[PDB]
Design a binder for these strands. Structure first.
Ligand code: NA
Ligand code: NA
Length: 327
DNA sequence: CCGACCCGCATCAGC
DNA sequence: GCTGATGCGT
DNA sequence: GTCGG
């Protein structure tokens, strides 16, 4: 439904949510607000009262009272006050740097560090992740169009295969469901020599190869099974340079790969329904394995998975395309 | 009423 | 020095 | 903040 329907309500709830996350440090409060703002974004009617809203799942008494104040007056007193509060807005603004969470934001602002400019003046006080988040502040807030993602997926699949042709790599995320744009790249990776009961360089070889060809430009973190960093498509030799982008690469045991691909493909709503259905059938699905449930509820040993379909077959479903996993 | 609401890595706190 | 807590991102 | 045992 058009954002003009309840966009004033959903912008209010999203602002309220950011302050819970970044200033209050109440992640559950943040998620209720985001939930309610989501269910209202999909409600196909211009809400006329807080009471109409309360019917919907995730909207309770406090959010029903805020919609009523917002409908009658056009604003929310408590939000208007938080917006003009110099400590709050500075803390909320600082968490937009990757690597600065609510705790570091509070400490920076507690000593006069309030802006990018102050950060640029105080690099001695930033860990490695935050220097990188500061360096690429604007680029990281930009979205990535699918044409760039296809180009980036090209480079990742080619260099992975260039390191070892038995590697299996799957760019998951909303990009695998067909999304027209993305906010980062999530690569899931496996090798037949790596299993649940099975070298600690499989990830490193692929990261190193992507660095040697100058696709990966920086590293936020890297261990034996997760790499988080920065990449960038090469310049056109005469055009503007592309903005640096975020990219994650996980190495997963081959016996849990398709469980992991299914999970990190999503959506989050689709995953819940499939987990919900799988229980009413006597199976438990998480991001690693699918296991059967005894009559008392005790899980059994994980069942063999060798594709996404294998999982669907177990729980008596017909394979759903990633395209159709919107819910 | 009142508890639930979903791990890998960098860094720090304590020993 | 090592082990465990915490912050952070996802 | 919302839900539910
Ligand atoms: Na409700
Ligand atoms: Na941040």
């Amino acid at each position: 439904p058009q954002e003009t329907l309840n966009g004033g309500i959903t912008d209010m709830l999203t602002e309220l949510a950011n302050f819970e996350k970044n200033v209050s440090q109440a992640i559950h409060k943040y998620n209720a607000y985001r939930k309610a703002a989501s269910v209202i974004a999909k409600y196909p009617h211009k809400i006329k009262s807080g009471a109409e809203a309360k019917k919907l799942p995730g909207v309770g008494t406090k959010i029903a009272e805020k919609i009523d104040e917002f409908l009658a007056t056009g604003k929310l007193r408590k939000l208007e006050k938080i917006r003009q509060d110099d400590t709050s807005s500075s803390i909320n603004f600082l968490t937009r740097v990757s690597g600065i969470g609510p705790s570091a934001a509070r400490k920076f602002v507690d000593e006069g560090i309030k802006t990018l400019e102050d950060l640029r003046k105080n690099e001695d006080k930033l860990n490695h992740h935050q220097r990188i988040g500061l360096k690429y502040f604007g680029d990281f807030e930009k979205r990535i169009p699918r044409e760039e993602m296809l180009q980036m997926q090209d480079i990742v699949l080619n260099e992975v295969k260039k390191v070892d042709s038995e590697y299996i790599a799957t760019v998951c995320g909303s990009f695998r469901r067909g999304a027209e744009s993305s906010g980062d790249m999530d690569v899931l990776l496996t090798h037949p020599s790596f299993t649940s009961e099975s070298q600690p360089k499989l990830l490193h070889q692929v990261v190193e190869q992507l660095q040697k060809v100058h696709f990966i430009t920086d590293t936020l973190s890297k261990g034996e099974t997760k790499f988080m960093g920065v990449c960038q498509l090469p310049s056109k030799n005469d055009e503007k340079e592309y903005p640096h982008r975020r990219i994650d690469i996980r190495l997963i045991p081959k016996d849990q790969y398709y469980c992991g691909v299914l999970y990190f493909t999503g959506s989050d709503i689709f995953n819940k329904n499939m987990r919900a259905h799988a229980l009413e059938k006597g199976f438990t699905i998480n991001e690693y394995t699918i296991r059967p449930l005894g009559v008392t509820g005790v899980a059994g040993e994980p069942l063999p998975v060798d594709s996404e379909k294998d999982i669907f077959d177990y729980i008596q479903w017909k394979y759903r395309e990633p395209k159709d996993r919107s819910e």
